[PDB]
Amino acid sequence: LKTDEFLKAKEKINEIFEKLNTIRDEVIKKKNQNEYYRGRTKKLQATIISTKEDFLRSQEILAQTHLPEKSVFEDIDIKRKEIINKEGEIRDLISEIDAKANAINHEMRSIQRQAESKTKSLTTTDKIGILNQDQDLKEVRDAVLMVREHPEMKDKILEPPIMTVSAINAQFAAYLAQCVDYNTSKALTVVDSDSYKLFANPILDKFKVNLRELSSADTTPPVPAETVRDLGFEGYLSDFITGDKRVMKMLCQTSKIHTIPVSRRELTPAQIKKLITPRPNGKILFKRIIHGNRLVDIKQSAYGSKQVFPTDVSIKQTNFYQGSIMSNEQKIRIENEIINLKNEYNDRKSTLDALSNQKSGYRHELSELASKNDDINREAHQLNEIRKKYTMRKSTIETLREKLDQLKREARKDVSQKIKDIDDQIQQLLLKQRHLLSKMASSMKSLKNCQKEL
Q: Tell me which residues in 18-37 interact with other proteins (CB under 8 A).
A: 20, 24-25, 27-29, 32-33, 36
Q: Which of residues 148-187 bind other proteins (CB under 8 A)?
A: 182-183
Structural element, H or E, at residue 342:
helix 338-382
CB 58 within 8 A of CB 397: yes
Sole window of 233-241, 321-329, 335-343, 399-407 interacting with other proteins (rule: CB under 8 A): 399-407
In terms of Cα–Cα distance, which of 285, 267, 293 is closest to 225? Answer: 285
Exactly one of 64, 125, 210, 319 binds other proteins (CB under 8 A); that residue is 210
Sign of the Cα pseudo-torsion (19, 22, 23, 25, in order): positive
Binding window for other proteins (CB under 8 A); candidates: 41-49, 115-123, 151-159, 234-242: 41-49
Residue 239 beta carbon to other proteins: minimum distance, rounded to whole angstroms: 27
Closest approach of other proteins to the CB of residue 99, in Å: 6
**Per CB under 8 A, 102 contacts other proteins:** yes
| Part of the chain binding other proteins (CB under 8 A), chosen from 90-98, 119-127, 242-250, 332-340 | 90-98
Residues 258-287 touching other proteins, rule: CB under 8 A, are: 270
CB of 267 to other proteins, least distance (A): 15
- Using rule CB under 8 A, residue 68 touches other proteins: yes
Residue 99 as a binder of other proteins (CB under 8 A): the answer is: yes
Q: Is 324 strand, coil or helix?
A: coil
User: DSSP characters for 410-430?
Assistant: HHHHHHHHHHHHHHHHHHHHH
Contact between 179 and 237 under an 8 Å Cβ cutoff? The reply is: yes
Using rule CB under 8 A, residue 95 touches other proteins: yes
Q: Which of 70, 316, 331, 448 binds other proteins (CB under 8 A)?
A: 448
Site for other proteins in 375-394 (CB under 8 A): 388, 391-392
Measured distance CA(49)–CA(39) in Å, rounded: 15
Tell me: does residue 439 bind other proteins (CB under 8 A).
no
Indicate whether 122 belongs to the interface with other proteins (CB under 8 A).
no
Chosen residue from 15, 39, 49, 417 binding other proteins by CB under 8 A:
49
In contact, 213 and 250? CB cutoff 8 Å: yes
Question: Segment contacting other proteins (CB under 8 A): 150-158, 162-170, 320-328, 397-405?
Answer: 397-405
Nearest Cα neighbor of 203 from 221, 226, 186 is 186
Distance (Å, whole) CA 206 – CA 71: 80
H or E stretch at 36? helix 23-59
Three-class DSSP category at 297 = strand
| Beta carbon nearer to other proteins, 68 or 222 | 68
Taking CB under 8 A as the rule, does residue 84 contact other proteins?
A: yes
Beta-carbon-side half-sphere exposure of residue 354 (alpha carbons within 13 Å) = 8
**Amino acid making up residue 211:** L
Kindly report the backbone phi and psi dihedral angles of residue 452, in degrees, each rounded to the nearest multiple of 5, phi listed first: -105, -30
- Asked whether the beta carbons of 208 and 134 are under 8 A apart, the reply is no
CB of 441 to other proteins, least distance (A): 5
Q: Tell the smallest beta-carbon distance from residue 67 to other proteins (Å).
A: 10
Please select the residue that binds other proteins; options are 12, 38, 118, 288, rule is CB under 8 A.
38
Rule CB under 8 A: say whether 310 interacts with other proteins.
yes
**Count of residues interacting with other proteins (CB under 8 A):** 80
Phi, psi of 167 (to 5 degrees): -80, 170
Region 134-153 residues binding other proteins, contact defined as CB under 8 A: 135
> Would you say 261 and 235 are in contact if contact means Cβ atoms under 8 Å apart?
yes
Q: Where are the alpha helices (DSSP H) in 60-130?
A: 72-116
Q: Which of 8, 43, 66, 80 binds other proteins (CB under 8 A)?
A: 80
Q: Which is nearer to other proteins, 352 or 430 (CB)?
A: 430
| Using rule CB under 8 A, residue 45 touches other proteins | yes
**Residue 317: how many other CB atoms lie within 10 Å:** 14
312 forms part of the interface with other proteins (CB under 8 A)? yes
Contact call for residue 311 and other proteins (CB under 8 A): yes
